[PDB]
Write a protein that binds this ligand. Structure first.
Ligand SMILES: Nc1nc2c(ncn2[C@@H]2O[C@H](COP(=O)(O)OP(=O)(O)OP(=O)(O)O)[C@@H](O)[C@H]2O)c(=O)[nH]1
Ligand SMILES: Nc1nc2c(ncn2[C@@H]2O[C@H](COP(=O)(O)OP(=O)(O)OP(=O)(O)O)[C@@H](O)[C@H]2O)c(=O)[nH]1
Ligand SMILES: [Mg+2]
Ligand SMILES: [Mg+2]
Lengths: 256, 256
């Protein structure tokens, strides 16, 4: 119909959940109806404003590196290590702070980070038991930020999730990022998000936004949980390919 | 209605493309109609038989390791290396043949395979230019199978795909497997499959079937290309977690 047809088109292109498309149009029609006729001028404004109103508050998409400990975990291959290396590098040139590493990736899959840690002249401590990961903290009792890379598996198995909670206890001075790949399938993230309810993820980290066709799926998830994204990884180059997004921002990215 | 309602239910559970569900039911109704009333006995037989008839011929899901050269490539993080290590190991205990390695993963991301290659007492040759990868072949001019791991990127960039075709020329004695993650999104695989048309993939390799909720998406792809799957990777343990599937098999796995 009116600017409502301009919206439907735009919205349909996003991988967004079929229902959501519907609702959002209704919310527009309603504004149109009980506010003041929608003009083909600010449709894309209410549209983005609405979709925006579904995602967590914009104040939950910031909290950049702050705690002495940064912990990344989640999905195999998504980019926990590569991303961690970026963040560290970032806060070493965009903050000059003291970088420190701790890898929990006990189970070959660990020489990657030692060399990187080396290229930046930063110490890394490999830790097997919750005990070891504790001794390692005191060592950096006088360090700025300590990036903790963790081994990745199929958190479907309840064993790997509690094991995660055993090695990395989660005290008051720790930032947890559940690193998921924008490449990921919606009904798949739906479950893993759930399996991680028992653990305190402060923020998400959607990677490979440069590989997935649509960013629909990722909105679908976000639009049903309380924490926003802290960074979005869009490439392999380190440390250039990382970025931070805001609800409006992410949404603008979503509308293609 | 008749056993047609028993089918619809079953089919709807698979992540299979919405259209396909429809068509398949029609094909059933038709059998029902012009063949001999469908009984709630062989519905799941025609059902699997039909879905089966959409996927490539069953003779295109076999061709196990045969050529002197095995090349795996595709999607970042999907499991090219981990899988390659499995295959080699396999053909060393399930065939005693001579294992050989060549890594094209020039651009840290390479010490993983040297140690593994070491644990099996097998030689690996790292190769930068098409020239180097050629010198390496002659070295194993007297070797059984040579597994070639390749670096992974965003084959969206046309640069990485032709570069793949430059280092690994693709002569008559080579087996190419496009390693995709069952974890992957359908419209995403749709494109990468395309970007790889210029290169000769003999077989697919869907990994992480143990991580994705549905296997719908993966059928969706297969049901629109000419080559079947050669192995399916369902875990991290090496070399236990690999398997081979057949259309009927894969389909039976699909119906949950
Ligand atoms: N296209 C693209 N590739 C990425 C991105 N982030 C990481 N990668 C690549 O994905 C692959 C795996 O990255 P890793 O960082 O090793 O993945 P991980 O989560 O630590 O992997 P595990 O330790 O096995 O759980 C590498 O080839 C990375 O360079 C991204 O934003 N975009
Ligand atoms: N759950 C599960 N994890 C797997 C499977 N195959 C591989 N992985 C894990 O996924 C991660 C990445 O595997 P890799 O083999 O390094 O991936 P890759 O394709 O060589 O990665 P790049 O070289 O970065 O392109 C590792 O943690 C693997 O152990 C699988 O079938 N299931
Ligand atoms: Mg890692
Ligand atoms: Mg690899």
């Amino acid at each position: 119909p009116e600017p409502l047809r301009k919206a439907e088109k735009l919205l349909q292109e996003t991988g967004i959940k079929e229902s959501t498309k519907t609702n959002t149009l209704k919310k527009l029609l309603r504004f149109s109806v009980e506010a003041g006729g929608l003009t083909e001028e600010n449709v894309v404004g209410k549209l983005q404003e609405i979709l925006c109103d579904m995602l967590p508050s914009a104040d939950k998409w910031q909290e950049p590196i702050h705690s002495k400990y940064i912990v990344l975990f989640g999905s195999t291959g998504a980019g926990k290590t590569t991303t961690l290396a970026k963040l560290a590098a970032i806060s070493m040139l965009e903050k000059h702070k003291k970088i420190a590493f701790i890898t929990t990736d006990t189970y070959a899959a660990v020489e990657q980070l030692k060399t990187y840690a080396e290229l930046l002249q930063a110490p890394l401590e490999v830790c097997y038991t919750k005990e070891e990961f504790q001794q390692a903290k005191e060592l950096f009792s006088e360090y700025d930020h300590v990036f903790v890379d963790t081994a990745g598996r199929n958190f479907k198995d309840p064993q790997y999730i509690d094991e995660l909670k055993e090695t990395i206890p989660f005290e008051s001075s720790i930032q947890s990022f559940l690193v998921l790949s924008a490449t990921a399938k919606y009904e798949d993230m739906k479950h893993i998000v759930k399996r991680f309810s028992s653990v305190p993820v402060n923020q998400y980290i959607f990677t490979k936004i440069d590989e997935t066709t649509s960013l629909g799926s990722v909105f679908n998830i976000l639009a049903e949980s309380k924490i926003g994204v802290g960074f979005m990884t869009n490439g392999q180059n380190v440390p250039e390919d990382i970025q931070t997004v805001s609800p409006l921002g992410f949404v603008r990215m979503l509308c293609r």
